[PDB]
Design a protein around this ligand. Structure first.
Ligand SMILES: *O([O])[C@@]12[N]C(=O)N([C])C1=NC(=O)[N]C2=O
Ligand SMILES: *O([O])[C@@]12[N]C(=O)N([C])C1=NC(=O)[N]C2=O
Ligand SMILES: *O([O])[C@@]12[N]C(=O)N([C])C1=NC(=O)[N]C2=O
Ligand SMILES: *O([O])[C@@]12[N]C(=O)N([C])C1=NC(=O)[N]C2=O
Lengths: 301, 301, 301, 301
């Protein structure tokens, strides 16, 4: 036998950081969950009980907290790049660091119409995430995402004109509920190293904000022909607004809300135009995915 | 043997309702999870295989949807009262109905600064709940609550002066993080029936809003001596603002954020006044409870 | 305002203990999650910022680990009684201790047909639990339970003869699937203190084993008329087999498996006698409860 | 813009099937959760609101149940292959089907020492899974796995000789607890189509059983130098026992159990040789991965 692939490290490292402005009194908090997995010349730890090649996962944990103490933790694209770069620079035999960060929301409270200097609310379980792959000799590859953004529209969604054969029971509809949990990912151009990442720092928060804005406005305003058609519109707009991202990926469940025929009970009308009460379905669910990039076709367009 | 207590029914009934204003185009959505459990002269279903006394749980489910079609689903205190009253009135041998409702958030989206007529966001997993116990001959007992309201303050929390003995290792502190998930319950005066509940309908939304407002403002503004002291202040204020509630209950976890001593690494200072990076602890957690009512002591106060 | 009820303590305290027989080499492991909440003369911690009356939750945590080091952790009824007794004896002003223990399964592995001396498998997420309420001057009240015991039978369950009215759509059936997650609780006679608990120690494991055995055999063998009828049979048998328990409680979901009519597709027959493929329903679910005790009726039986 | 990748279908489809032997009375149950995602000439559903190319997810759901009615659901490798093959054969424009199956345990109950003909227990949340990728013109690629197999050994695990630098605090140990949740995957040689899959049907259950047996015995018997070293031994043995699998992958968390120093309390000794009571850590956790294949090195071995 031989080792074909290996990576190891510390997962589920919860990290909080506070910034205190002593002049103004305003405090700002950040909370994340971090995973760092390393690759390199480590195969003998598996094959020969050679622990000399292992940077202990406990040490990786320590390093996450030390790096958070010594650097900004925002934007997460930067923090992840600093953290991954540390491992491949510090350890000659480590050649890749894979850093995943989930950022948790702590939104400043407004009390009596004024932002409070040191109190926060988890205003959504929506996350902002990064996946930062730092590969020695091959730069830094970053995927940024938002996830757990749960939305519903009560009309202006349709689904008709789909294939119908002997496996089909679904009725066409010109007016349905559409609800999803949005997972949207934008993948950046490869960066050559940490200096290039730093050179683009403002673009990270700006592009996350664009992605979120476009997602919400397109969902709300598109009289949707399908999940497929709507998500594509989102992706094409995000690509148009940031030239440093190469692709946009969406993964969207179709969280079904079924009509309830009540006509068996006193002739109650609760379908079609009279549909008011629905049964949300926990499972199963449609699942619709696509990755959108920029065109390179010049004929047969 | 004999049956000492029994109740049965349908749990986890997911319900959506939409209201459409055809004049304005504005749509409003409601989503809940409902449980209804019945009591009455049902013991022979357990002891004698007598199913004649069972209103099938499937029928209870149907009844939840029919009742939602024929009545408002808001405020949940009213919906639960209508629903519970139905069972004890319709079925002579059913003498209590226990209705639990969890209301899920669907907050209207603002798009380009304007409220959208038919698009919504799950802006928090915070819930608004009711427990409505409709007992034949003994009226309607309602407990209203908010739950899953997750908050954090980064300073202006203290904990010192606690008992110290041979089991104690905890350091006193004059400046710590305080974070919790708020579960707050207000219990209403007994109502004689559905007419009395209806007579107080506006008070339900108003009292939920007061409870939420008081919770947030007191959390944010109290330079807290303990979880105990802060929660008591919340409860006393809510009681002062609604004379139809008899008690207020809080159940609050103390979700610990531990300092991380980094002085072993290059003399890094990350404790006390220099504490910036903390380790959120998933478990264990303090758990602090109290039920507050109005005083009746006239001496030794 | 005044404090009407209060309790506080530490929740979610994970505890492992190992026993090592140095003569044989056999090791035995125990893992639990513990909650201890205290009551007593603590109201001034809420009303007056008086922390002197608070035994810190951190200290309660320490005490759980110290007590586990100094005593057996099995049976959990005993451990919980020792632990609760400690708080009301050690602290004059603490007058009740409420101890909840969830015991996690670590079943010894059999390797090549022989029990391994120090390797274990989580063979089920089924739990064994206790609730031990130690109340100064009023002894020790113990509720023991098993929970998360998930079972299914593919026939020999029926449900017919239930009430039928204008809310009813459910078809009678003489052959259905029955599946549940069993939560069964037995409540012991009040014990006067720790000596009386100790005097009955062997009965705890024996009664848990009886409850489990009776549950499984009755589920498997009863040609069930309803969940109600089957659960009652379980309870009556457990009461008959242990005179020191006063009541038995079951709480059982009816986890529905729906037939799927496929006759629209090539005349496929998949209902009634030809039902082979079913759709498990995640929600909603029936929920059926009862508490059974010993009879005291002497007439009209 | 253009579509670079797309797939869509139905997720979270719960499926039960029963087999009834009418001669013997013995019934056997199967329960799974299924996901099927399709690829093909579908880009215009995203770019042009062309629903004609969409086989509705609802129809995919119907097809899962129909296929389960008309075919064996075991082994899952076969069922997934039949199901995926159906989509690429039935629909000219569909060119890949990605089928994921999670199989849930229903183990026959033994009652009074005899296997019961129609009653079952969920004896573990451990799963058996498959990922079957059916790609037109490129056969069938199958990955089989077991997951959620939670184990612990109380001794005969070590971790010493790891890299030590200025980021390291971890103590070397020659005797620790080792606990994990095993996720083990074996990837089969590419199969040319459904006939080749069928030709190897007995190997699927046999190889799952080997993987499980090897996992448990190696975990129990290896005096482990590290998670890395132990998992490699598992993988090499599985490869040696089935020539039709090309690689074996393990993904193992190191679920830490920390010693508790109690020497501050009455000199209690609970470390090293006297360690009996430990604190299981929910997070963070080590995470150790490797993919093992057969060697092809002929020099510098
Ligand atoms: O995804 O869920 C489908 N299949 C289906 O049955 N639907 C009702 C869907 N709606 C869609 O928007 N697209 C789609 O492919
Ligand atoms: O609850 O968690 C405690 N015990 C304790 O150790 N603490 C740090 C606490 N803080 C409090 O506010 N109150 C309390 O009783
Ligand atoms: O509980 O789920 C019911 N109601 C119902 O509709 N059922 C199919 C049930 N089966 C039962 O065993 N009992 C019962 O009351
Ligand atoms: O993985 O958790 C480590 N790092 C570490 O700190 N450990 C205690 C580990 N034990 C291991 O078996 N391997 C490893 O790399």
């Amino acid at each position: 036998s031989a080792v074909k692939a290996a990576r190891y490290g510390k997962d589920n490292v919860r990290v909080y950081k506070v910034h205190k402005d002593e002049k103004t009194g305003v405090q700002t908090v950040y909370e994340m969950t971090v995973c760092v997995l390393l690759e390199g010349e480590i195969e003998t730890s598996y094959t020969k009980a050679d622990n000399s090649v292992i940077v202990a996962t406990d040490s990786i944990k320590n390093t996450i907290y030390i790096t958070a103490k010594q650097n900004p933790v925002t934007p997460p694209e930067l923090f992840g790049s600093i953290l991954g770069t540390h491992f491949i620079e510090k350890y000659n035999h480590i050649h890749a660091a894979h850093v995943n960060i989930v950022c948790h929301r702590w939104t400043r409270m407004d009390i009596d119409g004024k932002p409070h200097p040191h109190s926060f609310i988890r205003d959504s379980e929506e996350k902002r995430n990064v996946q930062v792959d730092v590969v020695e000799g091959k730069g830094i590859d970053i995927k940024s995402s938002l996830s757990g953004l749960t939305v519903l529209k009560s009309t202006n969604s349709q689904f008709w004109g789909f294939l119908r054969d002997e496996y089909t029971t679904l009725k066409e509809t010109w007016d349905r509920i559409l609800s999803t949990d949005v997972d949207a990912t934008w993948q950046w151009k490869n960066f050559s190293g940490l200096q290039e990442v730093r050179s683009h720092v403002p673009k990270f928060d700006a592009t996350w904000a664009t992605a979120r804005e476009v997602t919400l406005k397109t969902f709300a305003e598109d009289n949707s022909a399908s999940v497929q058609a709507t998500m594509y519109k989102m992706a094409e707009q995000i690509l148009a607004r940031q030239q440093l991202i190469e692709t946009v990926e969406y993964s969207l469940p179709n969280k079904h809300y079924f009509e309830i025929d009540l006509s068996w009970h006193k002739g109650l009308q609760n379908t079609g135009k009279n549909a008011e009460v629905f049964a949300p379905q926990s499972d199963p669910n449609g699942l619709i995915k696509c990755t959108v990039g920029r065109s390179s076709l010049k004929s047969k367009l």
